[PDB]
Design an enzyme around this catalytic site. Sequence first.
Site, mmCIF file in Angstrom:
data_model
loop_
_atom_site.group_PDB
_atom_site.id
_atom_site.type_symbol
_atom_site.label_atom_id
_atom_site.label_comp_id
_atom_site.label_asym_id
_atom_site.label_seq_id
_atom_site.Cartn_x
_atom_site.Cartn_y
_atom_site.Cartn_z
ATOM 1 N N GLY B 15 0.540 -1.286 0.011
ATOM 2 C CA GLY B 15 0.077 0.099 0.077
ATOM 3 C C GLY B 15 0.775 1.064 0.005
ATOM 4 O O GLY B 15 2.088 1.335 -0.276
ATOM 5 N N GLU B 16 -0.001 2.352 0.152
ATOM 6 C CA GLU B 16 0.752 3.805 0.396
ATOM 7 C C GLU B 16 -0.012 4.779 1.073
ATOM 8 O O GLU B 16 -1.277 4.842 0.839
ATOM 9 C CB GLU B 16 1.531 4.129 -0.903
ATOM 10 C CG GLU B 16 0.330 4.348 -1.898
ATOM 11 C CD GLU B 16 1.084 4.324 -3.272
ATOM 12 O OE1 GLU B 16 2.013 5.170 -3.661
ATOM 13 O OE2 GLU B 16 0.548 3.608 -4.313
ATOM 14 N N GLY B 17 0.465 5.460 2.151
ATOM 15 C CA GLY B 17 0.069 6.725 2.580
ATOM 16 C C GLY B 17 0.900 7.685 1.992
ATOM 17 O O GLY B 17 1.549 7.497 0.963
ATOM 18 N N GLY B 20 5.183 8.095 1.811
ATOM 19 C CA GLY B 20 5.527 7.016 1.093
ATOM 20 C C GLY B 20 4.926 5.768 0.930
ATOM 21 O O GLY B 20 3.700 5.614 1.240
ATOM 22 N N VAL B 21 5.547 4.803 0.797
ATOM 23 C CA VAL B 21 5.085 3.234 0.479
ATOM 24 C C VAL B 21 5.071 2.370 1.514
ATOM 25 O O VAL B 21 5.806 2.808 2.425
ATOM 26 C CB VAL B 21 5.987 2.562 -0.594
ATOM 27 C CG1 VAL B 21 7.378 2.866 -0.509
ATOM 28 C CG2 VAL B 21 5.306 1.429 -0.972
ATOM 29 N N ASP B 131 -9.349 9.627 12.563
ATOM 30 C CA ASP B 131 -9.671 9.115 11.261
ATOM 31 C C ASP B 131 -10.162 7.632 11.297
ATOM 32 O O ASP B 131 -9.448 6.790 10.621
ATOM 33 C CB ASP B 131 -8.291 8.993 10.389
ATOM 34 C CG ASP B 131 -8.599 9.281 8.889
ATOM 35 O OD1 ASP B 131 -9.670 9.333 8.660
ATOM 36 O OD2 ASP B 131 -7.705 9.190 8.154
ATOM 37 N N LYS B 133 -12.053 4.784 9.977
ATOM 38 C CA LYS B 133 -12.821 4.358 8.919
ATOM 39 C C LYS B 133 -12.286 2.961 8.422
ATOM 40 O O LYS B 133 -11.117 2.315 8.958
ATOM 41 C CB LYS B 133 -12.742 5.265 7.848
ATOM 42 C CG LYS B 133 -11.096 5.892 7.276
ATOM 43 C CD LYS B 133 -11.133 6.491 6.294
ATOM 44 C CE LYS B 133 -9.689 6.591 5.690
ATOM 45 N NZ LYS B 133 -9.642 7.506 4.665
ATOM 46 N N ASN B 136 -8.643 1.889 7.910
ATOM 47 C CA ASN B 136 -7.645 2.061 8.772
ATOM 48 C C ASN B 136 -7.893 1.137 9.718
ATOM 49 O O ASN B 136 -7.087 1.268 10.869
ATOM 50 C CB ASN B 136 -7.688 3.555 9.364
ATOM 51 C CG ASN B 136 -7.095 4.517 8.442
ATOM 52 O OD1 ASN B 136 -6.613 4.184 7.229
ATOM 53 N ND2 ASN B 136 -7.460 5.787 8.451
ATOM 54 N N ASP B 149 -3.073 3.778 11.361
ATOM 55 C CA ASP B 149 -2.899 4.961 10.743
ATOM 56 C C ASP B 149 -3.277 6.007 11.847
ATOM 57 O O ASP B 149 -4.329 6.672 11.627
ATOM 58 C CB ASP B 149 -3.707 4.954 9.577
ATOM 59 C CG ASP B 149 -3.222 5.966 8.542
ATOM 60 O OD1 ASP B 149 -2.471 6.972 8.911
ATOM 61 O OD2 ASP B 149 -3.501 5.870 7.378
#
Lengths: 262, 293
Positions: B15-17, B20-21, B131, B133, B136, B149
């Site tokens: 994945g990525e935020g 970065g990755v 956050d 959801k 996350n 997260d």
Amino acid sequence: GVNEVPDYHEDIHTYLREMEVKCKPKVGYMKKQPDITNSMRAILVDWLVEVGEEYKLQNETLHLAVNYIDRFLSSMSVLRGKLQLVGTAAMLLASKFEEIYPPEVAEFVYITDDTYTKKQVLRMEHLVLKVLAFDLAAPTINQFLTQYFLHQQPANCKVESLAMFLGELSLIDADPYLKYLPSVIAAAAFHLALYTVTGQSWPESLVQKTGYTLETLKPCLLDLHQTYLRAPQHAQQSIREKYKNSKYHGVSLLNPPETLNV
Amino acid sequence: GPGSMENFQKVEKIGEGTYGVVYKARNKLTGEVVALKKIRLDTETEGVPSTAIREISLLKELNHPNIVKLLDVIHTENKLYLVFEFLHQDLKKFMDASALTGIPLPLIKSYLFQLLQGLAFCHSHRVLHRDLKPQNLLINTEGAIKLADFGLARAFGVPVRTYTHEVVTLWYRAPEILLGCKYYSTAVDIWSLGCIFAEMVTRRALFPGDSEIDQLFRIFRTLGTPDEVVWPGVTSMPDYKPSFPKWARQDFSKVVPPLDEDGRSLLSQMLHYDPNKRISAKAALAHPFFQDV
Ligand SMILES: O=c1cc(Br)cc[nH]1
Ligand SMILES: O=c1cc(Br)cc[nH]1
């Protein structure tokens, strides 16, 4: 209501009491610093007060920065020429942690009158993070104070501001205030403020909450009373200036009591 | 601190935020599977980003079975790697991919109960998540679910002061935030979990707004437009408007039809307008809905 987290405030208080022990600077570190003194540190913190004012930072931010500095200087020897670099990086980290809109790095370089470069500030930020191992959520005097304020009957804004003021004064003088935990300084400050404005004393309800009595707080109270009395004479004056402002109800203009009757 | 990158073997990108990755990786010496979150700092001209300072500092404190565990932090001059326990999937992907005829009620219960345990621990340790959801919330093969997260998270004081406005992904954002209230608290995380509870039951978002005002209006058309009786102060809130349409509150059994009496009860208490009356995570753990978990 929920803004006072009724269901969690006790758990939170207990946790902060545990963490303030973990986050505590070494009481005697200044003697182990070859090139810096309590007086130099007083100058630094007083400057960080001004910086806080210049940028309209939270008081919590200031308290965090001082915590970071004192922990850092507990394991790292610093030459006088680099003391401000540590302080600038600490204030940057505290800002990133605590502020909605932290000042940019460039602004932190600007306030050091270009004594340091941006690269130096950024490298010191990394070093400080390494030394603290990113333990930045430290309990402050203020985190305790705001909880204690909820035991006022009724709430009084001069009492609140005066307590904040006295708590900030303690940041300046490592001797003696490094020997006291945030929760104790906060208690002393709260009692002294309450007593000065209203004549009342540390309430029984906070004895219940904290375990602290006027006996427990007596040593700290005596130092903090001395600090308050001498404050017009202190070499550092930025906190007195700051608390003349209507934002804090001009509490620095209130007369200290001559005696405590403890 | 303990680790270095030489002991990790990257397996694949997961994945990525921002900054970065995320890679799945394996510790070559211990066999442990981990997620490595890269935070690039050499590109950054403002030093270590505040999202990462908060994430790392707060996660170091938060040690709980239903909070994703930060194992280590590798800090090079140019990069920052956060080493996390690996979990195979997030709740959103699970809802989409399996859960085609539904998530069975036992698993919904188990998950909500765990989420509440995680959240209670956050709040007990002065942390708002801000956050919550399905994307996350991470699940493993053993049946655990964990909060992840913490980039948007925040260490609060008591009482709370004014924090960043416009936090929480819109669909999961509480009405007090939407109305611009000066203060918000632990109750905003409960609101999100309420939305998530509903979503686990239906597999669709409960309030899929396209805008702040659309988000509000969708909440109102479902729960009724709040007034002074249901929510003291609502009409004095910065972005409350007298012109707001006055929608009647619908029967709560029509909000999530498949949901039983206990579920409805708990859901309604999570979605209470007044942040002061909204149930806490701690108190919800005792709700009769969970008797058979
Ligand atoms: O897959 C993942 C991603 C993160 Br971030 C943490 C754990 N597992
Ligand atoms: O569309 C809208 C309606 C109202 Br009332 C307020 C803002 N925007």
